[PDB]
Amino acid sequence: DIKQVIEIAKKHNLFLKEETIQFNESGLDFQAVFAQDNNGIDWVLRLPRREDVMPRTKVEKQALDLVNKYAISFQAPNWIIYTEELIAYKKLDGVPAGTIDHNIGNYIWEIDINNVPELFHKSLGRVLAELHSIPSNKAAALDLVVHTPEEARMSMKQRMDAVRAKFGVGENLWNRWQAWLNDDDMWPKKTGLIHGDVHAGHTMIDKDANVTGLIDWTEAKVTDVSHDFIFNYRAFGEEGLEALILAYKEIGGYYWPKMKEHIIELNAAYPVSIAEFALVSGIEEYEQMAKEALE
Template sequence: MKPIINSTAEFLAVAQKHGLRLNAENVELNASGVDFLVAFATDEDGIPWVLRAPRRSDVIERAANENRVLNLLRKHLPVAVPEWRVNTEDLIAYPRLAGTPAATVNPVAKNYDWYIDQQSPSVTFVDSLAGAIAGLHTIDHDAACEAGVRVLQPVEVRQSLAKKMDQAKPLLRVSDLVWQRWQNWLADDTYWPKHSALIHGDLHPGHMLVDQDHRVTGLIDWTEAEVADPATDFAAYYAIFGESALADLLQRYQDAGGRVWPRMQDHIVELYCACPVAIAMFVLLTGDDTYLEPAQMMLSAHEQQMAGLG
């Protein structure tokens, strides 16, 4: 892989190499992403751009999948997605979509800076998000497969997660209490959907663009997209907004044509409890163990909650 971009000057140089002439005085770096260093810039014609530089070589292959997903989504999704104009090993660039992230990650405080009302998301926001997720999840699997998107059947989703849990267990030092909860959930058919769906895979507020009325108008950063468990796209929402807000979103999702099942909400709660597994897989992939401590803190919080419920 070519040298990783680390500075504004390097972004400008690589962008110019690919035919983008950017205003050097108006470049804003965003280092909050784990896969890409991002820059926001404006070209000589006043058009705003998003520039993404991969942080590691493994991101390149996943970016190829993301591009295939985006080409499919532009034909079917009711909200906007990026259209890559530059797609190389050292740079991805696209005209910035209209809208403002519902929240942005504050890397210093390690939390969100909110644009929408976190305490009471508007009906407009929740309705439009439900419609966007429903539109995504109802995209035809055959079309996804033909576009080269990875497709997992429901049984394969569970098998894959079970394997990841085995790999993550020693790294995370998972307690017997949490481990048994995971195994009970994996084994209980009543939790699990009998269908797969095309998912975003990392659907948190930083990847949701909204207009001034807080209507969701676009979704970005599709690196994790695949056909898999539809509940995945609700786990972050539950973690941030809580169980009552999740129930409301699921009802609106169903009203918009999304497919639900009797224990979908319970399943999302369990899925969130298992989120540290994904963090462990990232650590194993990259060798970056700085994420282990927050993952272990999440597990500890789950364990304390379970002990309290007991």
């Protein structure tokens, strides 16, 4: 694989320090290779795991084009090389806030989970408010999923019905979901460009736990911004959720009075996502997580 990497890089006019090549296999869509070029700059090489690379990454690249065009408070991958055989970009500054350990079923944290630095929330709030305000509507030909506020609500309604039809859903959980769907005042009246897979493994931080970059824009779309807040709630609890909401609101992010409550209900719909992923991915672990999560 190392020899293959060097050759693939060479074909794309990328020349590496062989001794620096390291593999990261945590991605389900790409093998990721870290390597320095001959000027000592750190690169990430995305080697696709499945065919039809161009069609399958078109959406992500459109989102990255928007972020690279508009955003200044955080870095996002800037694909200098982009072919069916290789995506390569300069590695973002900083390190992941945490990485998922699948055996343990939780994070290996770079930050102190018992004393989370308040700068993490302040900086993530800035990042998300900037991201969610990007004017995606100004693009001439976007292939991203784009929802109005009403469409985002109907999307959830439909996704829930589809999960119910295939997996079934416990009566009380279903009723909670429906109460959320039916409560007008809880739903946001603005949507935005989201990252869609915001979590510690994708949030790059500096030594002070400032979020300085976001990787992996596979799930980018224009919809309810709430999905980008779920990680804070699940990792840090209500306090971390409140801190992020506060920072986001105060820097000018779209805020509505029931935003926290809405995000908590979205968190209660976590099983929808697990069930969907089980279906598309065929990964046994997600199938069993889905069965237990749906009750």
